[PDB]
Amino acid sequence: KMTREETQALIQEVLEVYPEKARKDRAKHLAVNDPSIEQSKKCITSNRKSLPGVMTVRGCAYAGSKGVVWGPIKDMIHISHGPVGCGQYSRAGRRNYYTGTTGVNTFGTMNFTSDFQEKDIVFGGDKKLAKIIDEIETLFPLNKGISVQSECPIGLIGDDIEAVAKKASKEIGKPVVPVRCEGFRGVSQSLGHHIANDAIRDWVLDKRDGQSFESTPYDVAIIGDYNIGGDAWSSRILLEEMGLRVVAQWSGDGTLAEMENTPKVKLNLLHCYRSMNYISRHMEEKYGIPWMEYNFFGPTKIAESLRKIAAHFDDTIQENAERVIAKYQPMMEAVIAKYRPRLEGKKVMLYVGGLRPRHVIGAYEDLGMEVVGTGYEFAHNDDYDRTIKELGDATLLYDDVTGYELEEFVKRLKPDLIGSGIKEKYIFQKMGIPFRQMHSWDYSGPYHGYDGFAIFARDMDMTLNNPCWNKLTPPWKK
Amino acid sequence: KMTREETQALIQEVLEVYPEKARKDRAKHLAVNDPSIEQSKKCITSNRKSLPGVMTVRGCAYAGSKGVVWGPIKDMIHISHGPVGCGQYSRAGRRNYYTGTTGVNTFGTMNFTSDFQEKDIVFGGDKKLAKIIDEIETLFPLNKGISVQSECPIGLIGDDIEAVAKKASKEIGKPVVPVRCEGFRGVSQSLGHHIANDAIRDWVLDKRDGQSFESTPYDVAIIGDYNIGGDAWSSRILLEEMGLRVVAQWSGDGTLAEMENTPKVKLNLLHCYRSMNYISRHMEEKYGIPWMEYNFFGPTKIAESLRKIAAHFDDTIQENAERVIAKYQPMMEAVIAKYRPRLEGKKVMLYVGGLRPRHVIGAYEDLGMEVVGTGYEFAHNDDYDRTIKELGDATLLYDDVTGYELEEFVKRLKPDLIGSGIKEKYIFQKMGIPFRQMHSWDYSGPYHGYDGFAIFARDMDMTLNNPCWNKLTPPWKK
Amino acid sequence: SQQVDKIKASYPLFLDQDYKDMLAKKRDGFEEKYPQDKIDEVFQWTTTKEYQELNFQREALTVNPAKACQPLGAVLCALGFEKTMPYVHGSQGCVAYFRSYFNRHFREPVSCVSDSMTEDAAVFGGQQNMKDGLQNCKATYKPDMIAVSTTCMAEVIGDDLNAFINNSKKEGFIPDEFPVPFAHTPSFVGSHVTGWDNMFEGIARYFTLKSMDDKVVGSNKKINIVPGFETYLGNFRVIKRMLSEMGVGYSLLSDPEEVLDTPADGQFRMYAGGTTQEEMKDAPNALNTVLLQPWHLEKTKKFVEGTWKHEVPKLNIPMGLDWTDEFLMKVSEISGQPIPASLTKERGRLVDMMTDSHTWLHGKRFALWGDPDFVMGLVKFLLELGCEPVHILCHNGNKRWKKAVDAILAASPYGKNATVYIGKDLWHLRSLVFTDKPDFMIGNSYGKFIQRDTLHKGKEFEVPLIRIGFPIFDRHHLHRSTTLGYEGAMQILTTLVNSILERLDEETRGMQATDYNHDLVR
Amino acid sequence: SQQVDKIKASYPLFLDQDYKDMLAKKRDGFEEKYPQDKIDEVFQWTTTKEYQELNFQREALTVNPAKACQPLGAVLCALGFEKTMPYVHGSQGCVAYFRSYFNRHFREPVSCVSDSMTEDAAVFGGQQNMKDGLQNCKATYKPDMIAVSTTCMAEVIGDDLNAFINNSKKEGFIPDEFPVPFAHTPSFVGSHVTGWDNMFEGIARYFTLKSMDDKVVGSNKKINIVPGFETYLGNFRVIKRMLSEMGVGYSLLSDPEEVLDTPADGQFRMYAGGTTQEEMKDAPNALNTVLLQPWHLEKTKKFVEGTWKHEVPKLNIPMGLDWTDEFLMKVSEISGQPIPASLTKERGRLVDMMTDSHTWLHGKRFALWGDPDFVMGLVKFLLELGCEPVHILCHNGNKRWKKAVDAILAASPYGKNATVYIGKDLWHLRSLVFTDKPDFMIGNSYGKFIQRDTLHKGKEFEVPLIRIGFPIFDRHHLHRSTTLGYEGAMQILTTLVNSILERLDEETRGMQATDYNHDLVR
Ligand code: ICS
Ligand code: ICS
Ligand SMILES: [Mg+2]
Ligand SMILES: [Mg+2]
């Protein structure tokens, strides 16, 4: 319904709002897809600093380290190290599901913090940190280890958390992992991923290098699934139905032991490329473990992913993949017959973090829906490269979109549905546009796997076709 | 504190409101206690028709039959026979507690009704009633029997429920009891008690006359305790601690079997004289079972009652009574020490049905409180006779009090607490006068027995000394 | 026994071991109770489709009804008139019950008199009762009006109220000009709502029938509002508030909101507020009359159309979004007052709430009961929210009403699994929530026993009750709520979604078993 | 696997056998999980007096705090001003969280910008960020005011806001007369409430400090109202309503109730209502300033007393009966307006409710937490109701506040078993509700996890949560409630009594075991 030329005119009009410096910058982060482009020319600029004052959706390196990578590890204690804010706002906001007895052997929904006061700013927090670890050993004796998640002030005051950690780990006989994920570092959640992957590399991953382990030919790890609403469990089950043995999940429902055994696996299965390519690459370098990217959103991609994973093994696993796909076909066809007729032809705009802006397109297309706009908060060029093939022609693209831009694009494109985060949800609802949270799954899910797809389809239909959307206009204003 | 002369002047002032006919009548139902009075002359008129239009607190014969005597029998099904009102208003409004599986082997909180329509008025309801009994047998097969509780229309249309019942009982092999408790009969709940006691006499009580039963010298029945908030259970336990064997409870938590075995007991213990003296006297006539009146409100009366009951048996039971009294004295002393200092010297006015207006005075006196006014909805002269010795000198007395009278008396006497029913509760609260329901126990109790008395004392203190009473006057209107 | 520093009431006192033992002996020794296994087996059977079949074949027995009798409604109607005493000609047992029933719902005094007809009057009739009663009532309680209704005794016997009242006047028991409107309110016809209709039409007739000559429609430039049987204070208040915000001149005909909510300030007020007699006398001069609960105001409607000549608009009860919109638009049309910005914003705030809460509401299955207009408004709003009302019960409903509701259901996809039942009771409903289990019940306190029954089959079968309707006896101050207008829709929405979330928290509170979904954020 | 006509989400999907088996293998094969027995034993130990001892000996660790950081409060304060954009100088991670936290509580958009200071600025400071940020914010979102606060980064490095803003103006990034009030809001001092105080005093200074010459106390005949950090829409509304009813001229200084409740009518409104700049400029001309939450408005108070010369009345938060009475009587005195009939009746209706419900409330034991003013108002009202507040926790409380609460407790018999805790967290509170168990907790959604912990010990130990405070994330639309005035007291009373009755129904729902006390009427 819009030509490339119109989309490009939309971009130019939206940029009129900005001062020159801002405009010049933003012009690099907005694009229209064209697969008839030199695949060596970048389509878009990415992973740059946000402009001041423009209302980015982006978070900080602490979010990507503590909130994303570390926080889900269920049997360790993650200390939010600094003043009280960061840990409180991030307390149980991400549905990285786990099984445990919280406060006793798991700690995921708790907020441990050093709650810095002024004296800690002035005199430093290292002594406080040392005592904290003692207090944790007294009060939470079943913890398998501790992470230290640095907030802005730690770096700025010159605390030496590495020294505290080394001494404390020797004393207590457990990993104490210092993480320099202070929020002034990098531009976004992205650098926190990287810092966190390296903290794992440097302080956890090699602990069992000498040791024997009971291995099998079919041992894999799920890398970069944070089990949002049970996403990883509904993934795991398919991999085990196929005959594989999942030694570890990183880091949804994950444990220290699972991480530590991951160097013994035969294949790393990377779902979220953005967040955990770093450790995947390290593990191929040091241990010779291959890694492959896969996608468990929707039946098309699941089938592709199962067959691809199976072909890395042997004929039996390949046979098994065919059995698993066939078993779930009746279900998938039932889900499509029920919901695809209610969603056929509907247009969607997405805006998410680092993966799902491309990864969920196949699932929408399995319901006859078209993504007419997508973007990322903090993706890199390698993510945009991977997005091109997944996208329709002449699709609008936006990197680190501003509040203003996203609103204007929605007003012009007039999508039937928007998929984004909590800070966006209530804006677009007021505009009368159906909205589904594509981080939190709007307190639903899972969306990964065959079981996930049924819930995804129900939810898109529930919201898109809901009666509430016909009622926004008072009848005496028509 | 008011002189007899002042109280008598209060009565005269209040009566000024009425037309002459009403005045002349009401003047006979208001008195001041004088225990140095006549042996044979009544102090007050009672059990007469209510005046039209004056807002009596009284109910009807259906209330006294279905609501009071029959309703509590847990394993029979009681049909409210007539239009839908009576059964609905009386559904689970009285806390006559029982143990059972309701809908299966017990039926007490359910409303069974013939829900008369106009067709049933015109053509009569006998055919409807016959079908109902069938439908009951189908749907509630564990019922031990059926009662038929007549509402106003049954008598007035000439239905023959006695014929329906006798034929149905033959067929189903269980008692079907027709009760002519239509509300136009008598003047109050009182005649319903009588009709109900006779229906028991005539249709239930003699069924096991021929039969053997395993009896002992210490077998008693509790007659006239309806187990309000467990009142009967906290009574029963003391009787068993004393060495007696309670074969039946009439009719709190009571069953058909218990009633039917009552002719085999050695002693009928009558708590509520008003409601069940009738069947007590029948049982002494026909079976030679003696009956005695007792009182389980407050430690003074309980001790008196236990000793009196024990002296009907043998030295062993009497020794036992002394053991039971001694065992509970430390409790009673603790209750009095805690609560008597908070209630000492406080004045109470009561208005209840047929028993509690005299029976609870002892318990109030055990807490240092004085009843300065009392009265009954539907007592007879024999109840007023029993009240004289229980009352203080120059105490105001009121039979079938009108709304107007009770309000004026309260305004003048200025009691610290009022004990009456749900229709009175919210009137006096608005006047700033602490009020405790003395029918429903204000959803508390039990009040009978030693355990009952501790709850009674807590409740009087809770309400009389509550902070809410200091707050009725806005500070800018003082 | 008791610890005096921690006194136990019936619960949990009777769970003490000594009491348990004593009551186990009572049952075994003396009750001849069926064995537990057999009780279990029969219970099980009451939960089945087979039992449900037998249950729905009942033609004569009613169990656990969901209606009351006419004079209950007559009293409530009468309470809505200034310095009016409700007076029920007939037996006194009735008035004791009516008062108690309302006392327990409103936690307030409820003033009503009987004329205490006895056996003596059962043949000769209650003429003398009426004479002495009217005179006694007037002198004792000093009302300015006595509104007369009847118990079933008086209806059966056939007392002529009109004659008895006129004779009371002729012989000097009460003044000729003292207002004594009346209605026959037979308990064996219709229900409580019918009683309200009959009483209301009686009072309307009393002040307007003989004085029509000088009346001109529209001359006073107001709209009459008849609320019907209404037991939420908020409903009276929200209607007044909305009309005042629009600047619409109105008369609320029967308005008990003051007398059912007097302050506790040291004084008892038998009478407070209420519709004036002047308002009823002048009502034919209104532009028109709006009936808020038309399905129980049919007689009123015929009177208002036939004698007042008002063209009563065809409006549903103003519950939910559409029907509130239509009420306001019609009031706008009749009055000439535009719908103001305040009401427009209030509407959009409701719609905001709907968008915010839709995901939890979508597809939820409800059993529900109540009076016809209430039930259909709740049905309508549930459809607006994307909920499925599976079991819809109106004990006092009729065929014409059921057809109207069936058409509402047929116009929505959310209606596909719904059935409307009339003439069925809560024992019928009990079977439905076993055999075709919904998520929740919406109804009055009587539902608590269905919830208990369902839990006994097992936790996975329990159907929680959400208390909306009348009576509500086991919670405090819910009578202050609202169910009409945008305000009522917001409160209903909130109650529904939070009941859902509360139950989800309960089901996910099991440490290490279900608490994976015990989310902080919903 | 899934039945397509009955699709299961995480709950109860993962309770399916196949998933249970898979997760049992995950745990046993791969997690090296402690044995269940040991988990049980350690759990048990966390419920003990011994564990509580160790717990209260913490000097360095905080677990499950019950406070947030200053700039969160600065943002809320800023949102209460017309066409005002909250601007937080420092790191952008902060603003992402502030927005989300409010989005989740209010289910509304929450507009706030950062200037996105990065490592570049960590040595040199954020001057250029401020210049470009102000310019970008002004052009992109067209606020009439930008209200600047700080993240901890900017505080640590020591950016001079005053100079940076003045330099932004001097060099043409924003116009000279464009309003940019500011405040240092260090997260490592005090809490969110401190941030609100700091921001408010900043804005007050911006519009009044340099223009005091022409001001005369009382000249505009109004009362200023400063609400403080407030997250109930009803609270802003009830204050306005009561003052309007009294005919009192007033200015609510920081009023976000419009922008936190825009209608869903097809248009997104970034800004709505709010206190005007004119109101702030004129505020020194008021008769006086009333502070609704004085325990977090100390800096504001020093400014208002020292520069405006207002004799700020010594008033507690107007929660409960006495303190609402005192607020109204003080406003009456200052304004000369009598307290009207309507408020007098409203008060009496509250008192009525107290008389009606007192028996259920009497002696009930409560643990509770929140901000200082809220907590002490709740304590006060509980004492008015005859309840016992046994565990009183205020993480961000101080010694002066604790002493004031201890005196409130000492003036009532219901205070005898109460202890006030300051600087303690919800892991502390968890121990208290195990060792000295109350009947209920009153607090925010974080309490849900304590309720789960107590249920795991056993049903008889479970302490139910009653959600009053901030944040509330697991229920919908409670942000619309009221906790101030007679209206707020009525809603709190209703919530308390019905929580009690709800829990009693749960405990008495067991067929033939506990349902003897499952009464219809309460
Ligand atoms: S980790 Fe990443 S923003 Fe890959 S920071 Fe973010 S639980 Fe997003 S698009 Mo929230 S790179 Fe995961 C993500 Fe994607 S928290 Fe979740 S939804 S697939
Ligand atoms: S039966 Fe009577 S009115 Fe004796 S009808 Fe009434 S449960 Fe009263 S003073 Mo309600 S003669 Fe029982 C009574 Fe007393 S219902 Fe209860 S409290 S001791
Ligand atoms: Mg009341
Ligand atoms: Mg919203």
Numbering used by the authors:
A (entry chain C), B (entry chain A): 4 to 481
C (entry chain B), D (entry chain D): 2 to 523
Question: What does the paper behind this entry write?
Answer:
Anc1A and Anc1B are the same age, whereas Anc2 is reconstructed from an older phylogenetic node. In addition, all ancestral proteins crystallized in space group P 212121, which differs from the space groups for the same proteins in A. vinelandii NifDK (i.e., WT; space group P 21), Clostridium pasteurianum Nif (space group P 21), and Klebsiella pneumoniae NifDK (space group C 2). Global structural differences between the ancestors and WT A. vinelandii DDKK are relatively minor and within the range of variation for available extant structures. Among the two hybrid ancestors, the RMSD between Anc2 and WT (0.24 Å) is smaller than that between Anc1A and WT (0.31 Å). This helix contains several substitutions across all ancestors, albeit the positioning of polar amino acids differs among Anc1A, Anc1B, and Anc2. Herein, the D-subunit S165A substitution is consistently present across all ancestors and may influence interactions with HH S175 in the ATP-bound complex, potentially reducing stability.
This catalytic component is a heterotetramer composed of two D- and two K-subunits (‘DDKK’ or α2β2) and contains the active site metallocluster where N2 is bound and reduced to NH3. Three previously characterized ancestral variants were targeted from phylogenetic nodes within the evolutionary lineage of Azotobacter vinelandii Nif (wild-type, ‘WT’): Anc1A, Anc1B, and Anc2.
